[PDB]
Design a protein around this ligand. Sequence first.
Ligand SMILES: *[C@@H]1O[C@H](CO)[C@@H](O[C@@H]2O[C@H](CO)[C@@H](O[C@@H]3O[C@H](CO)[C@@H](O)[C@H](O)[C@@H]3O)[C@H](O)[C@H]2NC(C)=O)[C@H](O)[C@H]1NC(C)=O
Ligand SMILES: *[C@@H]1O[C@H](CO)[C@@H](O)[C@H](O)[C@H]1NC(C)=O
Ligand SMILES: [Ca+2]
Ligand SMILES: [Ca+2]
Ligand SMILES: [Ca+2]
Ligand SMILES: [Ca+2]
Ligand SMILES: [Ca+2]
Ligand SMILES: [Ca+2]
Ligand SMILES: [Mg+2]
Lengths: 506, 602, 56
Amino acid sequence: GPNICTTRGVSSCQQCLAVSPMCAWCSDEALPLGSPRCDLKENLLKDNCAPESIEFPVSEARVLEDRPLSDKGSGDSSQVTQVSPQRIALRLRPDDSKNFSIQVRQVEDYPVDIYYLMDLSYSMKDDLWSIQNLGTKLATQMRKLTSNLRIGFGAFVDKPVSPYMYISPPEALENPCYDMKTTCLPMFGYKHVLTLTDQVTRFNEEVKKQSVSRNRDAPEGGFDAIMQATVCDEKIGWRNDASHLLVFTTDAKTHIALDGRLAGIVQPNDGQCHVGSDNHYSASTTMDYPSLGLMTEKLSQKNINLIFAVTENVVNLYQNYSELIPGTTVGVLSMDSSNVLQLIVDAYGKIRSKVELEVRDLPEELSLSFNATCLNNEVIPGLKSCMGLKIGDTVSFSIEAKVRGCPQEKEKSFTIKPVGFKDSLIVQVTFDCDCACQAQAEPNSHRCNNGNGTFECGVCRCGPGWLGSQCECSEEDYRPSQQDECSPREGQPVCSQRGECLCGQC
Amino acid sequence: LNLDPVQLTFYAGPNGSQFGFSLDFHKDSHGRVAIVVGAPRTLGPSQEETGGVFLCPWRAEGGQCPSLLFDLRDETRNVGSQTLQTFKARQGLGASVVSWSDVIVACAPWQHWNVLEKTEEAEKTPVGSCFLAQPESGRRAEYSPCRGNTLSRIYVENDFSWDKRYCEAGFSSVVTQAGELVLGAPGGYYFLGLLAQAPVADIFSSYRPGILLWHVSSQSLSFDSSNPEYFDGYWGYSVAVGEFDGDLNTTEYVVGAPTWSWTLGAVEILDSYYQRLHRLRGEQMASYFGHSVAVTDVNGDGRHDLLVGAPLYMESRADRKLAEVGRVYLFLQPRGPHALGAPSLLLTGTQLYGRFGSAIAPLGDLDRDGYNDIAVAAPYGGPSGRGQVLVFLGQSEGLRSRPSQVLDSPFPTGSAFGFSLRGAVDIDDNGYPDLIVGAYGANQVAVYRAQPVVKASVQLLVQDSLNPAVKSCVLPQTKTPVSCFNIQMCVGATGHNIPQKLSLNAELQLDRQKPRQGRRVLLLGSQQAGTTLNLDLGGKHSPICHTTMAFLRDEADFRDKLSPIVLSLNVSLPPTEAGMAPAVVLHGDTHVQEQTRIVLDC
Amino acid sequence: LNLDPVQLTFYAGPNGSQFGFSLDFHKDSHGRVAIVVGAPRTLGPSQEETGGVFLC
Ligand SMILES: *[C@@H]1O[C@H](CO)[C@@H](O[C@@H]2O[C@H](CO)[C@@H](O[C@@H]3O[C@H](CO)[C@@H](O)[C@H](O)[C@@H]3O)[C@H](O)[C@H]2NC(C)=O)[C@H](O)[C@H]1NC(C)=O
Ligand SMILES: *[C@@H]1O[C@H](CO)[C@@H](O)[C@H](O)[C@H]1NC(C)=O
Ligand SMILES: [Ca+2]
Ligand SMILES: [Ca+2]
Ligand SMILES: [Ca+2]
Ligand SMILES: [Ca+2]
Ligand SMILES: [Ca+2]
Ligand SMILES: [Ca+2]
Ligand SMILES: [Mg+2]
């Protein structure tokens, strides 16, 4: 009928297929009337031109690597798979859309890494007295939910620089709480106290050896500690097999980026590990605070869930921070942190109660649409995250990719991944824009005036130099009156006296 | 738009001196313009980071500059019982340089100050100190409004009320037209922030060399507030002056509080008595809404307009939920001054972690069209992240939402190209404001000169619709008769300081819709439907229009008698790339289309 | 106010005079301008009382 492929001009394998995926190119060297080569497959198959020589790529999405979802991650965490499939090969012709599905299951007892980031400001001294025996009780409560728990510890106050640290008299540089007659320890930006380890006795031992320091202003250099803990895999000792938790305990506001200019610090924070051999942040005085964007990016890149265990005076503030960073939640710590164990347990439960998809290194051409199928068969379109899950539950996501145009690379790979987990799906999208017959070009097609036209795809590409049917029109347009005019059997006036009969238009 | 990116001026400072952190234009008495550049980490006399200010005279090649010799030396003066001390170590002399009339105010915000009374003291805190100078006469002076002699325990006794020990006054310095220096101390009143305003004449006339703690009699300071919102507001991070309340006698200050109300951010417009006329809240927390503030009348309606910067704004992209790019807000002041409300324009950056909005410089009227143009700098934007500056032109409604021009960093990565911006001053005196961009990472300043803007005008006249064969003037080189007519196109080039070598090019396309060599309408001469010819306007107030005789093909010859006959007149600059850089910018209408039809019985 | 008197452009005509009775600026379509001067008492077809116009 209409065959929008037939209109809009006909060039080669590229153009007809680029017009619409439904369009097909009948490269077979059949009758030109019988092989227009720019039409739908159904129309082309009727008029022959299809001795399996037709060009019509079919978009496909083959599962290259799939393993069944586990059900209990007690042993061989490396062999535990939470995302099915794991790697797919997708094929798309230009301006075509195709969808698939993924299954995400949170295992029953997954290994857990809890890192305790403690604000060692003076007002948090009482809290330090309710944490001494945190390791034993935390292990006791967590053993009901995991079997490979590993706890670490780090401390932070603020940058050891003038506007925040007392610098007079020189006795205050070694006891910033000298005037209140008590003894504190020198101001520190962030120090990594205990590496993540299973021995909770080590956690209870490193605590009771920590002392609080004193800072001037209410905001604390906290996000610097979060950044350094996140970006230091070797020092903190994160396992790339476990549920990474980073409990953030504080009672005041926090120093967002660009605040370091108050201390002469203008060099922006870069996501690098500067914690030296002494377990001290060695660039705290010569590097600005990290911004929310960079902190979020480094949290996602290292698969860390963030728990703001913050006191009641700042909770709303940090709550408003939680709705700026995926995979974070806020708990109401007490003045002396008398319930941080329950807070950590419930926060871990809530974190495991939500699954949110994240797309990584997605090419700009691809556009994704998500339909989340949670418990029962209800599917909510649009959103890529469904809540309400429990431990062991399984959820599914229907994901549609939609490429616009045709990238010249023809093969790009991106990642679909639930937030926090290491399990990921690698989608290798191959753009099948061109075709074999297009690659099989014959510019020296003797059939086309001794080879001045590229026989690429049955038709001959010769351009304005030879734009005739047989690549014979030595001059562009119909002005030269290309040889073998519309005059039937030749020797006839202007295509049977029809004036400009315009090739087949007579 | 017309800022030359090819020929730049490079002003260098000492290595690692942060030469370019802040900059301003100083006008010598003779009208000769110089650049004042702060280098807040220049080596002091005792091989220590103290600060410094360089007075770069304007040249073409550029290079090293002389420095203003301030007093880099710790001061100790015992006023009877007490012992006042000023520590000029890592003070940051040059973090805020502003030149007014013949004086230069170079502020060191991190200069420290202590008061040793017997055993007690007032704590060695940074109060800041602005250094005023007159390089043509040598008159030096200092201004430290936040210095105090109250002992530390007194503030503890009175809940740290009116605690001005951590002001860092000079963090952001502006000077009103009336000669009042206004300093934003973000850390004053225990990091609430304040404004310290004092006449420059009084500052010069109340300073005695040797006395460290004095009191300017006419200075005014902000008010400490018990409202929990202002806490840690950094109210004074950025400060600007403008007219926002009506009466031109009163001058109003625009002050940024980037962390106002729990890092939400705000900008306050308030009169000289520091009565808050209006408050412009932030939009997204931790975006630093108030980091940079500029005041200029972009829309030209005669009322000053406000430009706020949030370098850490995380936009809500479709693919990326929150990406840190930066955002500049444009607020337009209407009549009924206490009605400035929702933002009028929301410019947003592109590169991630580029900090779009770290510097908003009013450029004046760069294009010279009666509307004010600005420059917004992203020090880490650009595809390679080395730094970009985006020029936005003004228009009747807000200003252009796309960058007319984009300047890229000529320095290696990390140079912070764009951190400091300053413009609206004709450096070379060619009638067009220039721009100075300070990349302190490379310790250099780039000076961009605005080349002249040639405003073009096009008027292509085709008399009427014509008949295919009127059998008038014969086809060229033949007695064969055809239909003929005239094509006349007048092109004008009006602009300021245009050179005498201006020669545009007129592309005359005859019925461009049809393919060439066989068009429906050709020329009565060479028959080429497309004729591109040079038309010189090197100092001609009269547009020049070379009429051409055009031939029309036979009615039977041309078969599309229903398609419109559309002639194309395009104006382009000549290939100046063969020689030096293009000496002009051909902004304006340079491409028009004129349509006619085929008439009958005529 | 700024008309240069010390330097002038002098255009000659016929010895029969009248060269300058009326004149105007012929503005070429190309943008050029030339001075057209009518001399209404030049020679005729045969030494007759006629006019005549010059283009300078
Ligand atoms: C955390 O975020 C929430 C949601 O934005 C904040 O609550 C809302 O904060 C906005 C501030 O933009 C309030 O709007 C303003 O309220 C004031 C009165 O306080 C009014 O004078 C203004 O005209 C404007 O309407 C809004 O009322 C408020 N709503 C609720 C239900 O709280 C919250 O304050 C944030 N908490 C922080 C930053 O600690
Ligand atoms: C502004 O000051 C001038 C002083 O000459 C005065 O005449 C005028 O009335 C004032 N305008 C006001 C107060 O609106
Ligand atoms: Ca406490
Ligand atoms: Ca600090
Ligand atoms: Ca006013
Ligand atoms: Ca305005
Ligand atoms: Ca303008
Ligand atoms: Ca200039
Ligand atoms: Mg605290």
